[PDB]
Amino acid sequence: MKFPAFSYRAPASLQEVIQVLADDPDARIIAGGQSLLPLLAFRLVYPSCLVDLRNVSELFEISQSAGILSVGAMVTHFRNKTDPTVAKCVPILPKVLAHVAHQAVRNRGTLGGSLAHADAGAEMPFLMATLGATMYIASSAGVRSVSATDFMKGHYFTDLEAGEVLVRVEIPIPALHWEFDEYARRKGDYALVMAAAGLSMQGGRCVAARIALGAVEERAHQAIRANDFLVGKVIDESTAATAAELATEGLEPRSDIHGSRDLRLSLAKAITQRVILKAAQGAMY
Amino acid sequence: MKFPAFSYRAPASLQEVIQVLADDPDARIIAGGQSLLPLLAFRLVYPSCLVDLRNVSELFEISQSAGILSVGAMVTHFRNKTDPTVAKCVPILPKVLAHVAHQAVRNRGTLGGSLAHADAGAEMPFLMATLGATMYIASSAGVRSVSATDFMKGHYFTDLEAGEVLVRVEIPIPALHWEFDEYARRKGDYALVMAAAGLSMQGGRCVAARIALGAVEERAHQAIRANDFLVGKVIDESTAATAAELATEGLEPRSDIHGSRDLRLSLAKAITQRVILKAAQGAMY
Amino acid sequence: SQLMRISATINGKPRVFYVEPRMHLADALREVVGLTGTKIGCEQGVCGSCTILIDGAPMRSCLTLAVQAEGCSIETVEGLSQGEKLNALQDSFRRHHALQCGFCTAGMLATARSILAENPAPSRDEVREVMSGNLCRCTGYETIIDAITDPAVAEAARRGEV
Amino acid sequence: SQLMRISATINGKPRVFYVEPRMHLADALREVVGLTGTKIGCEQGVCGSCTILIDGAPMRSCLTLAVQAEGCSIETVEGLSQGEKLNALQDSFRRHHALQCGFCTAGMLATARSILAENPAPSRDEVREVMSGNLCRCTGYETIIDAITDPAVAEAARRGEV
Amino acid sequence: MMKHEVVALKKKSIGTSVLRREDTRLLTGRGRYIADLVLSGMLHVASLRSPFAHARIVSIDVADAQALPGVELVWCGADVAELSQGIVATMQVEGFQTTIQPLLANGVTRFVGEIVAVVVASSRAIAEDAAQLIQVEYEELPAVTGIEAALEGEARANDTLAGNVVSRTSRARDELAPIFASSAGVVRGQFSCGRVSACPMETRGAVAQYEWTTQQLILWTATQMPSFVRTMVAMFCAIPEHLIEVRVPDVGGGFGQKAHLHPEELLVCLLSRALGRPVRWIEDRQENFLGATHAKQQRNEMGLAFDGDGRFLALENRSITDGGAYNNLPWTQLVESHVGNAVILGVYKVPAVSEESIAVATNKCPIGAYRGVGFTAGQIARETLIDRAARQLGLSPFEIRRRNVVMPEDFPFTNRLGQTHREGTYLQTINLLEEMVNPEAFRQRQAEARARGKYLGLGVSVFNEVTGTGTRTLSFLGTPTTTHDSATVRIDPTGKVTVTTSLASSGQGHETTLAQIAADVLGVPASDVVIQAGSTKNTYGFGAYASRGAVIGAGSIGRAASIVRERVKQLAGHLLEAASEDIVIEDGLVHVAGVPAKGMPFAEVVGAAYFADATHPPGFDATLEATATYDPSDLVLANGGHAAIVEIDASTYATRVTDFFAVEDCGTMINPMIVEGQIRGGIAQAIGQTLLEEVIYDDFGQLVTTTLMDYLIPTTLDVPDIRIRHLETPSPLVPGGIKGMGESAMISAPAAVVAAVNDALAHLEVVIETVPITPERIFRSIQERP
Amino acid sequence: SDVVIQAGSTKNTYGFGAYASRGAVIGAGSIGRAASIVRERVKQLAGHLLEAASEDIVIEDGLVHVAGVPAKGMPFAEVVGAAYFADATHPPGFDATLEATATYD
Amino acid sequence: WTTQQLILWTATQMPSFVRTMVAMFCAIPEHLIEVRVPDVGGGFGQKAHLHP
Numbered sequence A, B: 001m002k003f004p005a006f007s008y009r010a011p012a013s014l015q016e017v018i019q020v021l022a023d024d025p026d027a028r029i030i031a032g033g034q035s036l037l038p039l040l041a042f043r044l045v046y047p048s049c050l051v052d053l054r055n056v057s058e059l060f061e062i063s064q065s066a067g068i069l070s071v072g073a074m075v076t077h078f079r080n081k082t083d084p085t086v087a088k089c090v091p092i093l094p095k096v097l098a099h100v101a102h103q104a105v106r107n108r109g110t111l112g113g114s115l116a117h118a119d120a121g122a123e124m125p126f127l128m129a130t131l132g133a134t135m136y137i138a139s140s141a142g143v144r145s146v147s148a149t150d151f152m153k154g155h156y157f158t159d160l161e162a163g164e165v166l167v168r169v170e171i172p173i174p175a176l177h178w179e180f181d182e183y184a185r186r187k188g189d190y191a192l193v194m195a196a197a198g199l200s201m202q203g204g205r206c207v208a209a210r211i212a213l214g215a216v217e218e219r220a221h222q223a224i225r226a227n228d229f230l231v232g233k234v235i236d237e238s239t240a241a242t243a244a245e246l247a248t249e250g251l252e253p254r255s256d257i258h259g260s261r262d263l264r265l266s267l268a269k270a271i272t273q274r275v276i277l278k279a280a281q282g283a284m285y
Numbered sequence C, D: 001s002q003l004m005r006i007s008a009t010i011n012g013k014p015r016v017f018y019v020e021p022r023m024h025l026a027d028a029l030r031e032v033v034g035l036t037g038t039k040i041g042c043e044q045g046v047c048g049s050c051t052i053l054i055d056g057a058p059m060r061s062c063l064t065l066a067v068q069a070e071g072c073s074i075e076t077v078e079g080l081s082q083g084e085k086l087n088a089l090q091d092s093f094r095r096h097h098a099l100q101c102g103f104c105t106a107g108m109l110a111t112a113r114s115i116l117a118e119n120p121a122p123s124r125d126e127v128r129e130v131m132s133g134n135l136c137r138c139t140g141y142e143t144i145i146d147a148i149t150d151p152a153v154a155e156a157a158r159r160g161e162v
Numbered sequence E: 001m002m003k004h005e006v007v008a009l010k011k012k013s014i015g016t017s018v019l020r021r022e023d024t025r026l027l028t029g030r031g032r033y034i035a036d037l038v039l040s041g042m043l044h045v046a047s048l049r050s051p052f053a054h055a056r057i058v059s060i061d062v063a064d065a066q067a068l069p070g071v072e073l074v075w076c077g078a079d080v081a082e083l084s085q086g087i088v089a090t091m092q093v094e095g096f097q098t099t100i101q102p103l104l105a106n107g108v109t110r111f112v113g114e115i116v117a118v119v120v121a122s123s124r125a126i127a128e129d130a131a132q133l134i135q136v137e138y139e140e141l142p143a144v145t146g147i148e149a150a151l152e153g154e155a156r157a158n159d160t161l162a163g164n165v166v167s168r169t170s171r172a173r174d175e176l177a178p179i180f181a182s183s184a185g186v187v188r189g190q191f192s193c194g195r196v197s198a199c200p201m202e203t204r205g206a207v208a209q210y211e212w213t214t215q216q217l218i219l220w221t222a223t224q225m226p227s228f229v230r231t232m233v234a235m236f237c238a239i240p241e242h243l244i245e246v247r248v249p250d251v252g253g254g255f256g257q258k259a260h261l262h263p264e265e266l267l268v269c270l271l272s273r274a275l276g277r278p279v280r281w282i283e284d285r286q287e288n289f290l291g292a293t294h295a296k297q298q299r300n301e302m303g304l305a306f307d308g309d310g311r312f313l314a315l316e317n318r319s320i321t322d323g324g325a326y327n328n329l330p331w332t333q334l335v336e337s338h339v340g341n342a343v344i345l346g347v348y349k350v351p352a353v354s355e356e357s358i359a360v361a362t363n364k365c366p367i368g369a370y371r372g373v374g375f376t377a378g379q380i381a382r383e384t385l386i387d388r389a390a391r392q393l394g395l396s397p398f399e400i401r402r403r404n405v406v407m408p409e410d411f412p413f414t415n416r417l418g419q420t421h422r423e424g425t426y427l428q429t430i431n432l433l434e435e436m437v438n439p440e441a442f443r444q445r446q447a448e449a450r451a452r453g454k455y456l457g458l459g460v461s462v463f464n465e466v467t468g469t470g471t472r473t474l475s476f477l478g479t480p481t482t483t484h485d486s487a488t489v490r491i492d493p494t495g496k497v498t499v500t501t502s503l504a505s506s507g508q509g510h511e512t513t514l515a516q517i518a519a520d521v522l523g524v525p526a527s528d529v530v531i532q533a534g535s536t537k538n539t540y541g542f543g544a545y546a547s548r549g550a551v552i553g554a555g556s557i558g559r560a561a562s563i564v565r566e567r568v569k570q571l572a573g574h575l576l577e578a579a580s581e582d583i584v585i586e587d588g589l590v591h592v593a594g595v596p597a598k599g600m601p602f603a604e605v606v607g608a609a610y611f612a613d614a615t616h617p618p619g620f621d622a623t624l625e626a627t628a629t630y631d632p633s634d635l636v637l638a639n640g641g642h643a644a645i646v647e648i649d650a651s652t653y654a655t656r657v658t659d660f661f662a663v664e665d666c667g668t669m670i671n672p673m674i675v676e677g678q679i680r681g682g683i684a685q686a687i688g689q690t691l692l693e694e695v696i697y698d699d700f701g702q703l704v705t706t707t708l709m710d711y712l713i714p715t716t717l718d719v720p721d722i723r724i725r726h727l728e729t730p731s732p733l734v735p736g737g738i739k740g741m742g743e744s745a746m747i748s749a750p751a752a753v754v755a756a757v758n759d760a761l762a763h764l765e766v767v768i769e770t771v772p773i774t775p776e777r778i779f780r781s782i783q784e785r786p
Numbered sequence F: 001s002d003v004v005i006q007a008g009s010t011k012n013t014y015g016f017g018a019y020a021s022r023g024a025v026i027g028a029g030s031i032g033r034a035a036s037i038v039r040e041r042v043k044q045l046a047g048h049l050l051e052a053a054s055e056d057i058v059i060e061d062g063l064v065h066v067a068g069v070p071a072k073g074m075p076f077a078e079v080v081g082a083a084y085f086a087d088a089t090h091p092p093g094f095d096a097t098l099e100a101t102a103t104y105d
Numbered sequence G: 001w002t003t004q005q006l007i008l009w010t011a012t013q014m015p016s017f018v019r020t021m022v023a024m025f026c027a028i029p030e031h032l033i034e035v036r037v038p039d040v041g042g043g044f045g046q047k048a049h050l051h052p
């Protein structure tokens, strides 16, 4: 269970990190190491060199400007879950982070590492896409941007190309009131299904809705059918239930030792219905 | 019993050795280490740095030229006791070395180190003086020579000045026939008394004699009274006995736990008589 | 050379050790520095047996490269006891029988100190929540919760001596 | 660094060890290299217990600076046996009961090997003479003389295997 | 008493020269001695010693030493005094003065070499560096430099005592003046032996590891008495005994020196506990001469009266021991003169005796035990006087002894000093020794040596010796002490045997010989037996000393092995339908005695004992591991003789021991090869004591001999080839008839050499009664000839 | 606190180990049998010294005394010390061995 | 090899058993084998088996 051999570098600048990766195609980036080291322990990957981003200070920056929250790739789950700016701008973020692993892991894990790892059951890839965030990626050719949805293409599959570095994520401050929840064997456990609901109400009537499901399929599922159904309706138990059915119909979860396809769908429906009601509650009051 | 601290240098040239000793007054030379290290073990000396002569090749040379044997300061007792050149030029040297310590010590001890240490009980200081050898000493100013007799001034007392290096010893190929012997608790042990007898025999009659006693006093004792007495005599028991008395009269050995003055004198007389008879025997052979 | 010079403070003392990048911090502490108190139960970041404090924060040493300890202040179980006496938290573990085989104990103490540093007297529920990342196969957990919430532990924590 | 990098061959294998000039070879072999077969009984060159072979010649390691091992080929008692079997000389010591406490044995073997190298069948007197620099407080020496002059030892010596 | 039990055994391995199993690791550099031990975080101790024989310690400053990098601690006498008052040494002897030796001098030092401060540092070299930084102010006081001064001077060596006489005893006080005044003949001598050192090639050493989390202490020490050390550390350091384990690695020679409790052993334990890290103490050669123990220094003013036929009429002996500043633990100053006078009559019948033993304190390191202890001095004196008496009467040294030795017809015989002789070969030894020597030929060789200016001399020494030293022997010696020596024996399931002993080896072959004993008791190959020693975790014993290992080992292992053997016989008898008492075990076969066909292999019976419940007879105790202590029910006297031929050069006074003959009777020999090794080793040390060795203190109390350059021990050129012959008179008190002999040669061989020198110089009407006999002493003796 | 348990080495004793909830029981039985063997020898010595039958001697709170008469008692350590080092206090036929081994089932 | 002795440290619940089995399955004399058990971090029966 020992890591295979590799060299190590921790450059002081983003530009240098890019140069190292460009010069050595077999080199790989290491951020918090909470997802990469387990893979190394199993010898599932054989990097020639690990390039640490610990010394690239710009990647640790958190700032807000003109309605948008900017979070650097090396910002840990801990900082994101406790930072004042993040809390005031995007309160749904720290609430979602409460579900990510445990304290020890959140002390090293980063937003960028989580997004680049792209586990289909991870909270961040799901949340960023759902919040309509934008990722900024740097390479030898410059900096480019891509939407969070386009960034996350599948399980362990991102829009990232060889030699590229995720620098930061820009999150538009939401107008919708968001609530999140998920089903996990034990709090902290990788979720079988997760759901987020963002609502806007005019009195007791919904005027805007964004329902999304994660960990059910390889990418976040924006439940358009549900969104359109909730618009113009009073959100009560029966309505939330119907929206939940609309949000899960068409989904194709995979059966494994932790749950069959049917169980997954049943859970997806239950969790979605729950979060919708919770969102409507917070939105109105 | 552990040596005190010190730095170490083993220069590749004599001039560098001289320079180091000259630049640091507390630095001391180390050759075979068989006398210096024991002193260090007892913390009787506190050098700042030990300057090894192991890399000064010229100090290891043995050669002969115009009736004289040249032995470098770093020539080990072992080499002196087995080298062909030495054996043919000064056969008395290897016979004397058989009495010096034991095999292991002889494999490291050197002629130069023995002479510089100048133990009044050592064989080399006594022998070199007796054989009328010349020491060549190097310093920043150049090379000077001094007779073996002047070199050995007393117990742990030589003509060597601060920063000087004994380079080689030149021994005149003896015309006299030499024999040596000593009295030690066990062969190899530091002698209570040693004696050498160099004789020239024309027929069965002595024409020239050089009788010397060592370890009795702080310096070799050239028994002139005995030398003069032996000239023109047929050497037999009574004659060798009388010469032995003449050679030891006036001597003042130091009384210690290994022997009183009186014992020393009695032994010096017995050993001297023995070596004279032996030299007479070998000379006529 | 395959070894890298790493400078870090361990249990209050500046240390310098040489490690290859392929070695995780747990192994480095155990095999290079010689502090075997830190235990390894999975090397996957799940069991928490290797939990230690890095710059005051609990982290999995099996998921931290030894080389990543550069410039950090590490605290292992060996640094807890002051003099030759168990500190308040350790003594409480003993009084409440919060350990049997003792393999998970080093990690338990690390997480526990982290909790008490932020809150001297946490509720049993808060403790069970934060300690959920540390596995124990011998005790059933209850006594560990008891030990952490012991009044002597709370008092020591308030005085900053846990 | 007050430590010097010394390069020497020990028992046929090229070795590199770091030592201070103040440490003698006996201590370096024992404490730095980890070959405790070489024993120390006086540190004055008299007992012979630290006797080893340097470039084939017996020398007192307590009177040799560890730094003076540079460029030398050293043979300690650990290098004698081949393939987990005592060689002729060692086996002879055992058959003749040439050791008791065994403290002087490493040194005895070094000197004996040297003797046998020059003369495969030395006389008892020759052996007593050359071995006179190795002290033994247990045996009374007779059996060591017996062991060295054993005909099987002489035979092995002639075949260059002692 | 059950401890007296003498188990029965059939000799098979016992009596054969089995090659030593320990030799292989000891010939490959894989022996593991105290200095070879490596412990994590291990620290090193160095000592600062007193440069004065007797001085008040005005002040001590250790600030600079404590500050030197690498130094972790520096203690002076006051620091230690708070942890332990020191080594308390006493004896159940009327008038004996108890002494308490402080681990470190505190306020006053009582001998050159006493420790005044200790430094613990990262390395021994650095500890020594720091020790030289310590500043001590002394006020030299008048010291007691010898026996004369101790008895007649005003100075007192140890101020905690009342006078310098530590002990004074006289077990026999017959009126002899009229006998010496009227006897046909008289010979007298004022014999004196100088101090000597056991001088083992490996010096003393110990490493302590105290663990505060368990409160347990492990003390590794090169000792001959592990159980003793454990108990004393517990008592003198006030540490619970069960929390202490003493381990003994391979030891490079002991000879008695390592049969004492050393201040340093206690110190490392105290230091390790204080620092929370291992503390290593490995002394150098100078410290062994300065702070261990010295031995053999006694003066014996002896007189022997005899009739015209050479029959001994009386023996008078005033014995005085230079005991040093304190009593060593556990032998005390009684280790020399006191125990020596108890056996002063040796093998002879002497009707009238008057002797006194005096031990005096002097400002020197404490006198201690060294192979043969106090028996040696008197042996030298008596045998030398016996030879002198013979020459005076024109009798051979062998003949005068035949006329005074306890004869075969005499056993059992109790001499004037209460020693009862029960079984030995005294007479036969004298006769065999003479045959070996061939005096007729010697006389021829001697006469022909004069013509070459060489003085040849023959010396004879006949002895008996107390072995298997236990309670009974200690009582006889006047040093009452109850001993305890247990052994454990387990028969492993597959039929192999595991023996655990309290005996500690320092080269005498226990690892091999004890296995031979166990093998014979259980009837299995010695190769199927392993001896476990060097740990106090199990068994308890006084250790190896006083030639007791073979005896005590035979007895204890015998008893323990018998217990489990009986259980095997009971099970076998049950399966074979025969009484257990009728079952024997031989060559690994358990069968009805006399009927080999009615049996089963040992492994099969043992297998059933462990794993076949149904085969067990009713009331059976299936436990196949047992422990038992053993202590002989009476003295176990061994005997023998030695003859030495020496050649002295008339001109140089050089002395050479050209021949040595030995006759030994240690009852049944376990391993003849090992026994002869013990004899030759002892003979070499004897030559050392008599012709070369002397620890010398000058008129001011300074130790002038602290190196191997000034202290000469024998080399290959000092010891001749030795001829040995054996006689066996089995002891009925020890299994296999085994008797001891470890010290034999050092008790008697020295006498043979001294007697030889005197025989060599007899024609010059000169005698030499002081050892070592150096060229100076020979030169002086001859110069002062009449 | 005056007792220490040594385990983890096959140098002495032999057992099947800990399994099937047998430790407390097997330990109690075996240690009990072993301690009893040496306990009896202590009582035999105490009986001799106190002039009483061994079967009437009890050891409680480190005190060795006649049952019901803690007045004629001796501290445990004193009796043990005599067992080891006071040969004259031993009763006839006594086995002074204070270390024993026993199997239990 | 110089003593032919084997020391096996193993996290086992049955030391004597392991010692006897090593001797049997490896044909090594039992008296030359010592099994040592350090502190063990839980067994629950798993460490009550002889492992290859």
Ligand SMILES: Cc1cc2nc3c(=O)[nH]c(=O)nc-3n(C[C@H](O)[C@H](O)[C@H](O)COP(=O)(O)OP(=O)(O)OC[C@H]3O[C@@H](n4cnc5c(N)ncnc54)[C@H](O)[C@@H]3O)c2cc1C
Binding pocket: A028, A029, A030, A031, A032, A033, A034, A035, A036, A037, A038, A053, A073, A074, A099, A100, A101, A102, A105, A108, A109, A110, A111, A112, A113, A114, A115, A116, A117, A121, A122, A123, A124, A160, A164, A165, A166, A167, A188, A189, A190, A191, C044, C045, C046, C063
């Ligand atoms: C026991 C355990 C439980 C966990 N539970 C959960 C959970 O409940 N939910 C969850 O979401 N996660 C969970 N995680 C994973 C955690 O969130 C990881 O920290 C995260 O997935 C990876 O971030 P990282 O900073 O550790 O990155 P690393 O592991 O270092 O690596 C992430 C991957 O992205 C690459 N990479 C890193 N940074 C960049 C960058 N800026 N640009 C480009 N490529 C980059 C690396 O090369 C690697 O392939 C768990 C981890 C453990 C050990």
Ligand SMILES: Cc1cc2nc3c(=O)[nH]c(=O)nc-3n(C[C@H](O)[C@H](O)[C@H](O)COP(=O)(O)OP(=O)(O)OC[C@H]3O[C@@H](n4cnc5c(N)ncnc54)[C@H](O)[C@@H]3O)c2cc1C
Binding pocket: B028, B029, B030, B031, B032, B033, B034, B035, B036, B037, B038, B053, B073, B074, B099, B100, B101, B102, B105, B108, B109, B110, B111, B112, B113, B114, B115, B116, B117, B121, B122, B123, B124, B160, B164, B165, B166, B167, B188, B189, B190, B191, D044, D045, D046, D063
């Ligand atoms: C156990 C033992 C027994 C011995 N017995 C005897 C014996 O019987 N007879 C005998 O005579 N000797 C005896 N020796 C000593 C032996 O001969 C030493 O080797 C010799 O005295 C010193 O030579 P060395 O080459 O070892 O020099 P080192 O010990 O290195 O040093 C000797 C001294 O000379 C100085 N020095 C060395 N070389 C030079 C140079 N070229 N120029 C200037 N200064 C220099 C050093 O600085 C030092 O002060 C014995 C030694 C031992 C250990």
Ligand SMILES: Nc1ccn([C@@H]2O[C@H](COP(=O)(O)OP(=O)(O)OC[C@H]3Oc4nc5nc(N)nc(O)c5nc4C(S)=C3S)[C@@H](O)[C@H]2O)c(=O)n1
Binding pocket: D100, D101, D138, E253, E254, E255, E256, E370, E371, E372, E467, E506, E507, E508, E509, E510, E513, E514, E544, E545, E546, E547, E548, E549, E550, E551, E666, E667, E668, E669, E670, E671, E672, E674, E675, E678, E681, E738, E739, E740, E741, E742, E743
């Ligand atoms: N009948 C007998 C008697 C003895 N022996 C063997 O010879 C040995 C020594 O005999 P023994 O008289 O039983 O004495 P110990 O075993 O108790 O050994 C101690 C004894 O041993 C002597 N010899 C020594 N030899 C060595 N190598 N090292 C020491 O430290 C020695 N110390 C001395 C001193 S002092 C003493 S007291 C035994 O162990 C035994 O292996 C035998 O085979 N048969």
Ligand code: SMO
Binding pocket: E224, E255, E256, E257, E259, E369, E370, E371, E372, E373, E544, E545, E546, E547, E743
């Ligand atoms: O240890 Mo031996 O009796 S002097």
Ligand code: SMO
Binding pocket: F018, F019, F020, F021, G013, G044, G045, G046, G048
């Ligand atoms: O070790 Mo427990 O019997 S399953």
Ligand code: FES
Binding pocket: C039, C040, C041, C042, C043, C044, C045, C046, C047, C048, C049, C050, C051, C060, C061, C062, C063
């Ligand atoms: S070993 Fe690190 S989490 Fe289990």
Ligand code: FES
Binding pocket: C098, C099, C100, C101, C102, C103, C104, C105, C135, C136, C137, C138, C139, G041, G042
């Ligand atoms: S006490 Fe055993 S795993 Fe926790």
Ligand code: FES
Binding pocket: D039, D040, D041, D042, D043, D044, D045, D046, D047, D048, D049, D050, D051, D060, D061, D062, D063
């Ligand atoms: S330790 Fe080297 S000769 Fe004695």
Ligand code: FES
Binding pocket: D098, D099, D100, D101, D102, D103, D104, D105, D135, D136, D137, D138, D139, E201, E252, E253, E507
């Ligand atoms: S065998 Fe012990 S010193 Fe030689």
